[PDB]
Structures are given as C-alpha cells and as structure tokens.
Amino acid sequence: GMVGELVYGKADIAIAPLTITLVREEVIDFSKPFMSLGISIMIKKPQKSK
Amino acid sequence: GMVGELVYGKADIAIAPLTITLVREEVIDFSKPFMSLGISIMIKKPQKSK
C-alpha cells in the first residue's frame, strides 16, 4: 500500500486518510493530525410516520 | 513557563495539558496528541420549571 511505497522509495510523500498507528510510525515519520476523528454510530433518521 | 524549562535545560521533559501550537513546535518536539479536544460551549441546565 501507500506506506510501502514510501519505505521502498517508490514515492517521496503520501497524503490521504492515513491512520496514525504505532506500527506505521516505527518505519515512517508521520505529521501532526490534520483531522481528528473517532468511532461513531450511524442509523436512519428515520423518521417514518410512527 | 514549562516550555522554557525545556529549551534552557532546567527540565528534561514537559508532561502536562500543553497546547500543540506552531510557535511551540519551532522550539520543542511535541509528541502526538494524547487527548484530542476543541473549543466548545457551556450553558446552564434548562427546563427547571414548573
């Protein structure tokens, strides 16, 4: 994937929704967060007539 | 303040609710965020009556 192209030299930078994990930080250097997020819930409105 | 005691060698690390700003990143190495936050709103408890 994207991280791999950075480690093996097939690219010089990667910009995308890349999750800041420790397993990746060991091999590459991340920038500070430009978009903070977390797990959240998704449902209908609904609203329906009830 | 705390950032000063790192640049001047009076301390070895600063662990605190320290804002990750650009002016501070120029003089000290920040770690990744241990606690994401942002500006919010605070109001009273509504519907107290009656």
UniProtKB/Swiss-Prot annotation, chains A, B:
UniProt modification remark: Palmitoylated. Depalmitoylated upon L-glutamate stimulation.
Compartments reported by the entry: Cell membrane; Postsynaptic cell membrane; Postsynaptic density membrane
Coiled coil ranges: none
Binding site for L-glutamate: 17, 19, 24
Induction: Down-regulated in the pyramidal cell layer of CA1 in the hippocampus by global ischemia.
Tissue: Detected in forebrain. Detected in dendrites of neuronal cells. Expressed in the pyramidal cell layers of CA1 and CA3 and in the granule cell layer of the dentate gyrus.
Superkingdom: Eukaryota
Protein purpose: Ionotropic glutamate receptor that functions as a ligand-gated cation channel, gated by L-glutamate and glutamatergic agonists such as alpha-amino-3-hydroxy-5-methyl-4-isoxazolepropionic acid (AMPA), quisqualic acid, and kainic acid. L-glutamate acts as an excitatory neurotransmitter at many synapses in the central nervous system and plays an important role in fast excitatory synaptic transmission.
Domain notes from UniProt: The M4 transmembrane segment mediates tetramerization and is required for cell surface expression.
Family: Belongs to the glutamate-gated ion channel (TC 1.A.10.1) family. GRIA2 subfamily.
Subunit annotation: Homotetramer or heterotetramer of pore-forming glutamate receptor subunits. Tetramers may be formed by the dimerization of dimers. May interact with MPP4. Forms a ternary complex with GRIP1 and CSPG4. Interacts with ATAD1 in an ATP-dependent manner. ATAD1-catalyzed ATP hydrolysis disrupts binding to ATAD1 and to GRIP1 and leads to AMPAR complex disassembly. Interacts with GRIP2. Interacts with GRIP1. Interacts with NSF via its C-terminus. Interacts with CACNG2, PICK1 and GRIP2. Interacts with GRIA1 and SYNDIG1. Part of a complex containing GRIA2, NSF and NAPA and/or NAPB.
Extra information: The postsynaptic actions of L-glutamate are mediated by a variety of receptors that are named according to their selective agonists. This receptor binds AMPA (quisqualate) > L-glutamate > kainate.
Name this protein carries in UniProt: Glutamate receptor 2
Organism: Rattus norvegicus
Gene: Gria2
